Symmetry: C3
Subunit: 149 residues, 3 copies
């Protein structure tokens, strides 16, 4: 069809980073949607359904409570200011307390999605503050995409 | 674009309450959808994608156990009765009773979304049970939207 | 509309099992999509927005830590290999208390969604690993749907 669409996943070969990639199974990047500088570029003006999921993994809560963030930013015009379209935070560890067991693995998914008005050339970014907790070793766990509506 | 659409956000001014607003950047309310009674009113029959996200924050868990709820209801005809379309529940504080420290800000987001057949005149509500844990201070943290498909 | 669409819900009568159903208010199974073997069957090739949400609830965790998974898989041709399109993992328990604390109940919602180019006869499955932990007590808590775009 002619509808600009994109659904990229995190390249499981990009150890320690969130590399969006469409060279994988069940991924899309068609009709003007481009992947430029790890961001998606909007080919036309209009409404788009934007979304994303990232899966976090760690184990045990080794001091320093981690705040997990996930945002889809918009950089209008042709590299203007970065503004968050969708944003969600999570804390995987509350405790960490002395004496006892340890290393109980934890998993924390985050999903963001919304309908927005985008101008030609705008750039979308799906970002995270903790690429070191990123769990992309298996499929469907981390993804980002948009569809013109 | 001729399709009934909306994407409202939590008014950051709202004195400790959740007040949907379409008067903030990257917000929508077009082609017939009206903001009426903090609810969204459908201008015509048809399929509709309705989504919503709320973020919750807090420091420490003053003993007790909080339950966080979020739910988009449907109130059809000419004022019928609320019926759950989408609903979620979360549990922030799993433990807290002995003393040996304090402070540890937690974050809990909840996302709801689905495709629904509605009639002209139906209104949609997205309510939480605890506006006192609501984190509508910045970004695209709290939003309610819909779109004709 | 004339767009293939479905939005099925967890049948409350199927206690302790995940049985999808369009046999309830605000559910949909129209324009070619079908419920076969508890799976939604794709009636035509196209870009589909796929989503699903499950709510897990449990009474404490007397020892051992549970893992909660929720995936949407695609089976092409007709009973061909399985590939996860959407997948999220979660762990409702990180502790375990030998006396003192008493089996506090937990809630864990998981939402999954994306757009995929599917083909006619393709079957999609929305799975979970712990049906004994599924919460379809109230409406809107467990659903599965698709829509052609």
């Amino acid at each position: 069809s002619d509808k600009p669409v994109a659904h990229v996943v995190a390249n499981p070969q990009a150890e320690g980073q969130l590399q969006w990639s469409n060279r994988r199974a069940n991924a899309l990047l068609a009709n003007g949607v481009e992947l430029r500088d790890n961001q998606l570029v909007v080919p036309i003006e209009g409404l788009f359904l934007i979304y994303s999921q990232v899966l976090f993994k760690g184990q045990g809560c080794p001091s320093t409570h981690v705040l997990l963030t996930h945002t889809i930013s918009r950089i209008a015009v042709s590299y203007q200011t970065k503004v968050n379209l969708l944003s969600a935070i999570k804390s995987p560890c509350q405790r960490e307390t002395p004496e006892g067991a340890e290393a109980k693995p934890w998993y924390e998914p985050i999903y963001l999605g919304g309908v927005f008005q985008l101008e030609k050339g705008d750039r979308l970014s799906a970002e995270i503050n903790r690429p070191d907790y990123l769990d992309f070793a298996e499929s469907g766990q981390v993804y980002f995409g948009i569809i013109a509506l």
